[PDB]
Amino acid sequence: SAYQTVVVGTDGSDSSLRAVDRAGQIAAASNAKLIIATAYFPGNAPIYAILREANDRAKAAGATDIEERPVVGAPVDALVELADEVKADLLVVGNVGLSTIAGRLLGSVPANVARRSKTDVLIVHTS
Amino acid sequence: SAYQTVVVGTDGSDSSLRAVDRAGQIAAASNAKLIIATAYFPAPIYAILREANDRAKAAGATDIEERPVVGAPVDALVELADEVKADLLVVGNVGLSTIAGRLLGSVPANVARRSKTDVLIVHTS
Numbered sequence A: 001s002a003y004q005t006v007v008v009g010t011d012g013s014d015s016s017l018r019a020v021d022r023a024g025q026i027a028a029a030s031n032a033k034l035i036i037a038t039a040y041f042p043g044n045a046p047i048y049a050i051l052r053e054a055n056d057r058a059k060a061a062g063a064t065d066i067e068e069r070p071v072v073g074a075p076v077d078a079l080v081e082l083a084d085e086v087k088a089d090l091l092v093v094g095n096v097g098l099s100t101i102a103g104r105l106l107g108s109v110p111a112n113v114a115r116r117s118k119t120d121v122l123i124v125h126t127s
Numbered sequence B: 001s002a003y004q005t006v007v008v009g010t011d012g013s014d015s016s017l018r019a020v021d022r023a024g025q026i027a028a029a030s031n032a033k034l035i036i037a038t039a040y041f042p043a044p045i046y047a048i049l050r051e052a053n054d055r056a057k058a059a060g061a062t063d064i065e066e067r068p069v070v071g072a073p074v075d076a077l078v079e080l081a082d083e084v085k086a087d088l089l090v091v092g093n094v095g096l097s098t099i100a101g102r103l104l105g106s107v108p109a110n111v112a113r114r115s116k117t118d119v120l121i122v123h124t125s
């Protein structure tokens, strides 16, 4: 059953843009819609700079159906909620934060996304 | 450039066979080889792997290897992915969102953290 809708979270980090490269490849192969999301607490010119570069990276990896979503709020909430809202088949994040003791105990975006998601989660090895 | 070598872990559970189903489909769509791995301690095992092969085929995959590996699930999956130069490791989600899991460890969380490859955690339960 092919992925139809893939959501990828980027904060503009090089690590995260690697997560976008991969989501873009997976989307192009599944023939899926890719949704690039960037969560932020709000001026807001850099959020759209992040989304256009992510778009360019995803398009270079093959994706052709790409949507950009600037989302107001915290990263975990914004990605999980977005994924429920668009009925995403897959949610993609990088792995920054997964290995520190403080991230394991206090939280990180990939770990909390993995725990909270009701869909498949791809954790791209970006660091 | 796609994923070319996909590893999926199964213990024979129905939940882990849904992870095999998804890995099969990804392998098909990517044009990759699928490796089906079952970690154990010292054969139920070939029964398990034959079911998994059947499911993976049903899913579109054709280039399949069965690989039984000795040891604990996380160690065996992570070492195998290293040895076979896996581009993607696929596991199901049992234990991931439970406190028992934070306390005893879960396969998916430990794999996500310790693998050196992309990890797809399938929402199998």
Ligand SMILES: Nc1ncnc2c1ncn2[C@@H]1O[C@@H]2COP(=O)(O)O[C@H]2[C@H]1O
Pocket (backbone or CB within 6 Å): A008, A009, A010, A011, A013, A014, A015, A016, A017, A019, A037, A038, A039, A040, A075, A079, A092, A093, A094, A095, A096, A097, A109, A110, A126, A127
């Ligand atoms: N502000 C954000 N918006 C969307 N996703 C984010 C944000 N911050 C962190 N993430 C995700 O968490 C990931 C942690 O590792 P990466 O930097 O490789 O990639 C990151 C993104 O996928």
Ligand SMILES: Nc1ncnc2c1ncn2[C@@H]1O[C@@H]2COP(=O)(O)O[C@H]2[C@H]1O
Pocket (backbone or CB within 6 Å): B008, B009, B010, B011, B013, B015, B016, B017, B019, B037, B038, B039, B040, B073, B077, B090, B091, B092, B093, B094, B095, B107, B108, B124, B125
């Ligand atoms: N002995 C094992 N061999 C390989 N993979 C395992 C083993 N035990 C658990 N797993 C993996 O961890 C996942 C936990 O959820 P599932 O049962 O959906 O799918 C399981 C497998 O992918």
Ligand SMILES: [Cl-]
Pocket (backbone or CB within 6 Å): A099
């Ligand atoms: Cl560690």
Ligand SMILES: [Cl-]
Pocket (backbone or CB within 6 Å): B097, B098, B099, B100
């Ligand atoms: Cl719990």
